[PDB]
Amino acid sequence: AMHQVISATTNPAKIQAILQAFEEIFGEGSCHITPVAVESGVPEQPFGSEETRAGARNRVDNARRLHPQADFWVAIEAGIDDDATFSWVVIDNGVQRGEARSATLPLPAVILDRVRQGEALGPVMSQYTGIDEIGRKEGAIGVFTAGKLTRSSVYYQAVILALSPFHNA
C-alpha cells in the first residue's frame, strides 16, 4: 500500500522538500508523490502573510477537486511580507489540515524596491545573480546563505512542522 500525496506544484525544490519530509515522518518508500499543476486563483507571490496562506489553501482545495481519491494534498506558496520572503505550507488529509510558515529571509532594499513595483522575486534574483530560474534551484535562500541553506532545506522544515497534526495524540 502507499500514501498518495498530491503536490500542488511542479517546482522541483518544493517537490523535494515534500518527498523528504513525508518519507522522514511516514518512512522510506511509504509515499508516492504526484505533482500537479493547479491554480491558486490569485496572482503568484501574494503580498501579506494571510494572503499567501489563502493562496496555499486555495491550491490544496483545487488539487483535491482534481485528485479526489488521494490521501494527502499539499501546497507550498511563497509570498512577501515585512520586507521578507517566506512560504506557507498547507497539508490536508481530507479531514484534518496542518499548516506552517517557513522561516523568513530578510530581503535587501534593492530587491524589495523591485518586488514593490510588482516583480516576482525569482526573475529579479535571476537578473541580480545571473542564475537562470533560480527559484527552481537553490533560490534566493541559497544565494544569500552562501549555499548553507537552500529553498528545499528550509521548505523541508516547514513541511515537517505542518505534518505535526497527522502523527500526534
From Swiss-Prot:
GO terms for biological process: nucleotide metabolic process; thiamine metabolic process. Binds 1 divalent metal cation per subunit; can use either Mg(2+) or Mn(2+). Keywords: Hydrolase, Magnesium, Manganese, Metal-binding, Nucleotide metabolism, Nucleotide-binding. It comes from the Bacteria. Substrate binds at residues 9-14. Mg(2+) binds at residues 39, 69. Its EC number is 3.6.1.73. The keyword Amino-acid biosynthesis does not apply. The keyword Magnesium applies. Its cofactor is Mg(2+); Mn(2+). Signal peptide: none annotated. It is an enzyme of class 3 (hydrolase). One of its GO terms (molecular function) is nucleotide binding. It holds the Pfam family NTPase_I-T. It catalyses: XTP + H2O = XDP + phosphate + H(+); ITP + H2O = IDP + phosphate + H(+). Homodimer. Phosphatase that hydrolyzes non-canonical purine nucleotides such as XTP and ITP to their respective diphosphate derivatives. Probably excludes non-canonical purines from DNA/RNA precursor pool, thus preventing their incorporation into DNA/RNA and avoiding chromosomal lesions. NCBIfam families: inosine/xanthosine triphosphatase (TIGR00258), PRK05074.1 (NF003459). Belongs to the YjjX NTPase family. This is Inosine/xanthosine triphosphatase. It comes from Salmonella typhimurium (strain LT2 / SGSC1412 / ATCC 700720).
